């Protein structure tokens, strides 16, 4: 029993963290085989960060403009190219700790683990969700740029995020491992703001199913709802429109608990209008949206506490 924000074991990812210094800027890079990936803004000074032209800035650099350090040992750069918002630094060694891996761009609502890193040195791990507005509510200080987010399935690390910057609200922006930003955000210092966020309906529903799997059903009711009547309510409360795709994704969970999706929707509709009446669900006073249906299957019992 129990239900917590659980991250993936971080070992396979720790073996790939290095430091990258260019001129006077130090940040973190990702060492896979004989390549090191990092944010391109490593090639910027303070002055440069407003209004940079990376083509022009990068062409003013050689292989030995870049310093990369794996633990104590210096790695020599022998090739460089730019790819969207990242740099790809070819090095003299292939990482002996390179795990099997993949580069995936994740979709809003999906979760991943983040290894927060400073000076190429791993300092903590946490779980979060890619928000609808393409930000993450992480925790980063200066020097965390190039810290990565990932999923582990079996033995294979799926890299989905690299950190680049922080926004005025205090939430975070970055890139997939092709160097393409999540969101309409850019690689420079201007007036940029997170767009308005929404609560992640599919995940709230997943988390309700977990509450039941773990033996709680106080919030259930006798009603049912149509998808469209649920949406009219979802909009009032700043929840995402629920779709048939989302209803199909909830099938296995509906089957394990014997509660129909649309019945759980009426459960939730009622939670939204009436409040939680001073009660908790899986130890929380609010509706939780940072667990996917997958996260619930992984973490919970396959056997319901009936």
């Amino acid at each position: 029993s129990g239900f917590r924000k659980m991250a993936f074991p971080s070992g396979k990812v720790e073996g790939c963290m290095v430091q990258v210094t260019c001129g006077t800027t130090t940040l973190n890079g990702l060492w896979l085989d004989d390549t090191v990936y990092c944010p391109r803004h490593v090639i910027c000074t303070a002055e440069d960060m407003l209004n940079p032209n990376y083509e022009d800035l990068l062409i003013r650099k050689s292989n030995h403009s870049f310093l990369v350090q794996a633990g104590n040992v210096q790695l020599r750069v022998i090739g460089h190219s730019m790819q969207n918002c990242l740099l790809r630094l070819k090095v003299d060694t292939s990482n002996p700790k390179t795990p099997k891996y993949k580069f995936v761009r994740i979709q809003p609502g999906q979760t991943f683990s983040v290894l927060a890193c400073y000076n190429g040195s791993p300092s903590g791990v946490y779980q979060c969700a890619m928000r609808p507005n393409h930000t993450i509510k992480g925790s980063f200080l200066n020097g965390s740029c190039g810290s990565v987010g990932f999923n582990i399935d079996y033995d294979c690390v799926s890299f989905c995020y690299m950190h680049h910057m922080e926004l005025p609200t205090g939430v975070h922006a970055g890139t997939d491992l092709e160097g393409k930003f999540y969101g309409p955000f850019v690689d420079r210092q201007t007036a940029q703001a997170a767009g308005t966020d929404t609560t992640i309906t599919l995940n709230v529903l997943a988390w309700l199913y977990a509450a039941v799997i773990n033996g709680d059903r106080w919030f259930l009711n006798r009603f049912t709802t149509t998808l469209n009547d649920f949406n009219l309510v979802a909009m009032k409360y700043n929840y995402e429109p629920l779709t048939q795709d989302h209803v199909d994704i909830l099938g296995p969970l509906s089957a394990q608990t014997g509660i129909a999706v649309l019945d759980m929707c009426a459960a939730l509709k009622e939670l939204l209008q009436n409040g939680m009446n001073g009660r908790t669900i899986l130890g929380s006073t609010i509706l939780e949206d940072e667990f996917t249906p997958f996260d619930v299957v992984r973490q919970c019992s396959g056997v319901t506490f009936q």
Binding site: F140, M165, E166, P168
Partner: peptide, 5 residues
């Protein structure tokens, strides 16, 4: 303003 970290 934003901040590249």
């Amino acid at each position: 303003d934003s901040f590249d970290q």
